[PDB]
Amino acid sequence: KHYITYRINNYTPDMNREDVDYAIRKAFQVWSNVTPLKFSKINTGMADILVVFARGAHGDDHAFDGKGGILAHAFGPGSGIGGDAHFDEDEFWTTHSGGTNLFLTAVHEIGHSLGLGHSSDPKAVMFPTYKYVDINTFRLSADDIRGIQSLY
Ligand SMILES: C[C@H](NC(=O)[C@H](C)NC(=O)[C@H](Cc1cc(-c2ccccc2)no1)CP(=O)(O)c1ccc(Br)cc1)C(N)=O
Ligand SMILES: [Ca+2]
Ligand SMILES: [Ca+2]
Ligand SMILES: [Ca+2]
Ligand SMILES: [Zn+2]
Ligand SMILES: [Zn+2]
Numbered sequence: 001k002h003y004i005t006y007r008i009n010n011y012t013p014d015m016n017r018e019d020v021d022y023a024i025r026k027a028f029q030v031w032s033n034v035t036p037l038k039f040s041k042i043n044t045g046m047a048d049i050l051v052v053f054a055r056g057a058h059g060d061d062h063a064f065d066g067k068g069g070i071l072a073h074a075f076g077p078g079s080g081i082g083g084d085a086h087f088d089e090d091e092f093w094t095t096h097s098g099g100t101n102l103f104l105t106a107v108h109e110i111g112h113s114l115g116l117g118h119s120s121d122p123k124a125v126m127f128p129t130y131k132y133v134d135i136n137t138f139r140l141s142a143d144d145i146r147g148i149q150s151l152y
Contacts, residue, residue: 002152004083004114005040007047010054014093015102023095024051027106030125030138031114034145035152048083049113051106055089064088071130072105074112085109097132104138105130111144115151119143 006028011020028039057063060081062073067090074085085106092099107125119126121143140148 002036003038003040004049005042005047006049006051007042007045008051010052012053012087012089012093012102014099015095019095020093020102023103024106027103027110030107030140031110031148034140035148037114037152048077049110050081050084052084052086053089053093054086058086060086062086064090066090067092071100072109074109076112076115083113085113100130101132101135103135104132107138107140111148114148116144116147119147 006024008020008024011017025041031037032039052058055064056066064070064086065088070088071091072085072087075081075083077083087093087102087105087109093102094100095102104125108130111126116126118128119141121127121141124141124143126144126147
């Protein structure tokens, strides 16, 4: 199906609540812009993709590892934790270059939420390693486009 819902379960205290909403909205928009996917934000109740901030062990057999290392993870589409995107609260989430940029990380993780694996293109958002790029000139690489359009 092309209609997919999300809910921001909780908000990192690192950031303004409004900035988390915006970063997440823009991350979904990135993928919506290159597919027929329609995303809808839910405030309360059942949603396909939950956006969660948590530290250490947090219920899903994939515990986080403290500051650094693994920044976030996400599960491919399914029931329950399927589709959910988890961000390690031990990171320092930001709208800027400092710490770990939430928008960029969210684009990567939503990619996983939708069923993508990793890319071999070093410029792809789905390359395995986080790298800050200038947010205002950010673009999905042609390989990201191939990946997502193959699924939707
Ligand atoms: C501290 C920071 N760490 C990272 O970038 C690390 C390597 N990457 C991760 O934390 C992966 C998550 C990530 C990648 C990106 C990104 C952003 C922009 C461009 C390219 C990539 N954003 O988040 C972890 P994952 O979701 O792939 C994951 C895979 C397997 C398991 Br099991 C669990 C999770 C760094 N190396 O700068
Ligand atoms: Ca889910
Ligand atoms: Ca970590
Ligand atoms: Ca934090
Ligand atoms: Zn998790
Ligand atoms: Zn990844």
